[PDB]
Amino acid sequence: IVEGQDAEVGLSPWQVMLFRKSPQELLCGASLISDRWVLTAAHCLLYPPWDKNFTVDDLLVRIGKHSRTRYERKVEKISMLDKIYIHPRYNWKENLDRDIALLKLKRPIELSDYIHPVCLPDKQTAAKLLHAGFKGRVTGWGNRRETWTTSVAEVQPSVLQVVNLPLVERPVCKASTRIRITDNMFCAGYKPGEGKRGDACEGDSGGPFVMKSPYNNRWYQMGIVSWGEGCDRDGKYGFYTHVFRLKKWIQKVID
């Protein structure tokens, strides 16, 4: 998270880190939507150009963490995966359209103060909440800065990071890039004249973009961190997979 701040303990209880089994490395973010299901970005799993195609055997999922500098053992869960569901119309060749994946956990998990699922949106909530200018929130352990060379300096939070970003109108999103944006994706982030900054960065993808409903006091997952050109560049925005548009697919793979 470029320009975010340290998350509060218990801030994001649906956060999930997708790790590489051995050598263990953080590959992406993810979120808990039930005691058996984790939601993430397909590209975190399959990207043919880089011969990437992880299986349930090279993966591990960590849950209940807001500080990456220790094995939080007592509040933290590590689970193996049972199954991986990738959208059959995911597009890695041209623009990562339908960049969504579902991970079934091996065994259900025991919720706690630190482990609790977020809500998927319904027809009326997406209506109320999806308006340019409304702010959502992105979380993750990814890099705190984009960069050149190595830039191995800093860029690695020891605590989960948070940044709230505004929803940008579709026409501004389309004109910021020469990539064909589809209806299964929305962009968020500040405009050049807003002075403020913030964006998702490497290692944050697959993570959640949530918004709190004033009508029921609940947090709802509106997007999945998907892609962008660089991190926090002026005139550019981050692109998120539109959860509500993919709601149908999510529903078919759970029943």
Partner: peptide, 29 residues
């Protein structure tokens, strides 16, 4: 779930987090 989106250390505790007002302020703009 059915009790999704309500946090144990926040909503359940009538405690609003540090940056929540920034979100709400954006809604009524």
């Amino acid at each position: 779930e059915a009790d999704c989106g309500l946090r144990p250390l926040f909503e359940k505790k009538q405690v609003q987090d540090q940056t929540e007002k920034e979100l709400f302020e954006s809604y009524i703009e």
